[PDB]
Amino acid sequence: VLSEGEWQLVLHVWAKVEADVAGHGQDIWIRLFKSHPETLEKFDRFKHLKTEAEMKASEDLKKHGVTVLTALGAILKKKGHHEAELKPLAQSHATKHKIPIKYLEFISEAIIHVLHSRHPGNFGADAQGAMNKALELFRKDIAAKYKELGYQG
Numbered sequence: 001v002l003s004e005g006e007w008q009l010v011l012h013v014w015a016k017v018e019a020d021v022a023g024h025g026q027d028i029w030i031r032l033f034k035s036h037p038e039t040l041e042k043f044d045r046f047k048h049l050k051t052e053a054e055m056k057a058s059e060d061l062k063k064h065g066v067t068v069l070t071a072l073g074a075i076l077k078k079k080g081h082h083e084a085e086l087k088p089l090a091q092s093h094a095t096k097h098k099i100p101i102k103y104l105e106f107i108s109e110a111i112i113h114v115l116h117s118r119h120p121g122n123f124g125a126d127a128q129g130a131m132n133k134a135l136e137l138f139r140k141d142i143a144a145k146y147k148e149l150g151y152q153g
């Protein structure tokens with residue numbers, strides 16, 4: 001359980017991210033694919049991209065980034081009361097896409113790296129600690145759902 005003070009730090013920096021959802025989406029997925037190439041293999045729709053240049057020019061990848069950040073933003077705004085939002089996400093990622101928990105850890109790392117680079121003034125040590133706590137809560141609850149659904153993860 002996070003304290004109200006910790007949620008405030010998380011939503012304060014997220015408000016800045018919302019000023020340019022598409023741009024943040026691009027930086028995050030590009031950071032992930034470059035740092036962990038194996039994650040790209042899970043997208044039959046993007047597995048052909050060979051360079052950072054091709055990724056940055058992809059309109060479809062940009063669109064998907066917006067979809068992903070909008071879904072994550074809705075969860076964070078619930079401040080822990082996200083049971084209803086997690087069910088459909090857990091089902092599709094465990095049963096259809098087959099995404100291991102380890103890959104959710106990799107994208108959490110990419111999110112923190114991008115926020116640190118673009119928002120240093122609003123992402124100091126205390127704020128980073130609060131964001132890590134929020135993302136750990138997310139992964140913990142998704143993992144529990146994965147188990148109930150029959151996927152090891």
Ligand code: HEM
Pocket residue numbers: 039040042043044045067068069071072088089092093097099103104107
């Ligand atoms: C930050 C956590 C993530 C969020 C909030 C998220 C959200 C979503 C959403 C909303 C969709 C579309 C609806 C659906 O199929 O459920 C989606 C699709 C998908 N996600 Fe995720 N996702 C996350 C992490 C990942 C990761 C780490 C991978 C793989 C490395 C992944 C792979 C996929 C794939 C393959 C699809 C289908 C794309 C397509 O072919 O159109 N997701 N995700």
